[PDB]
Amino acid sequence: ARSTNTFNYATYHTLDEIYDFMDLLVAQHPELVSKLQIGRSYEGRPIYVLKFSTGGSNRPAIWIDLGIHSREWITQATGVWFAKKFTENYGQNPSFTAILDSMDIFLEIVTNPNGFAFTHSENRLWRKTRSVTSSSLCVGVDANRNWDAGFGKAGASSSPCSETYHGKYANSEVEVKSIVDFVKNHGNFKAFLSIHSYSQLLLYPYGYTTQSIPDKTELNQVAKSAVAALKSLYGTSYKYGSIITTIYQASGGSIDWSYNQGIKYSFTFELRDTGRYGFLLPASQIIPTAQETWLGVLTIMEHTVNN
C-alpha cells in the first residue's frame, strides 16, 4: 500500500498499482534505483524502465523485459518481485552484490501497457498491442513478431486479426521501437532477457532461421546450467534449446534481433505452467514461480559478469 514492505506480492495487480510500486521502490532506495521513461504507448501511457545501478558511466548492462504479451500475467508479477529482490539482496548476497558492483540492470515490468490495461478491463486473454490501422476493424500487433529479425517470414501472420500479426513493417509498434532505440543508444548491453509464459522453456536464437548461431555451444551450456539451478528449488522441469528446434519457426522475435545486434547472452524464458492453467496461473504460484526463475536468471547474470 504505502511501503514496498507492505505490498502484497502474492496477488495480481493493475497497471496503476504496479506503476505506484515503482515510485515507492525508488523513493525507498534512491541510491540504487531510478525510474526512466523510454517512450509512450500507442494510447499515450508512459513506458517505464527501472534502472538498478551502483554507479559508473555506461557500465555493461543486462536487459530484462516482461509482459510484452499482456495476458501472460505471471510475467509482470514476477517482474515486481524481481525489483524488490534486487533491493533486498544487494549487499547481502555475495554473488548478486558482485554483479551490481560492476554492471547495471534495466528492468521493464510492463512492456505492453495498453494491452495490460485491456486485459483488466475487457479481454483477459488479449495478447497484442492496441494500435489501430485504417484498412481493418481489428486492433493490435503481436509485439514479439514485430522486431527486425527475419521480419515477415514464416512464423508470423499477415492477417491483422490474427493473434500473431506481425504489423505493417519492422518496429512499427512504438512499444518495440522504444526498446530498440534505448538499447542502440546505450550500446553496452551484454545480456538481453525477455520473459513470457507458458511452457517452461529456456530458449536461445534463432527462431526465424534453422541456421545455428556461432555461440551455440556456449549458450546451450549456459541454458543447461540455468535450468538445473531453477529446478533445484521445487523440482520444476524446463526444456531448453534454440527457438526453432524447441517450439517452431517464429519470425520477428526480440531475442533474434538482440543477438544480431551483438548481444551474445540473449535468452527467452517461458514460465509456468505446461498447460493445466496456461495463462490463468493461480496467484498462489506467483512467489514460487518468481523464486525459482530468479535462480535461473542469476545463473545467466553470473556467466555474463565473468565473460
Ligand SMILES: O=C(NO)N[C@@H](Cc1ccccc1)C(=O)O
Ligand atoms: O509467448 C509465448 N508464449 O508461449 N511464446 C513465444 C515464443 C517465442 C519466444 C522467443 C522468440 C519467438 C517466439 C511467442 O512469442 O509466441
Ligand SMILES: [Zn+2]
Ligand atoms: Zn509471450
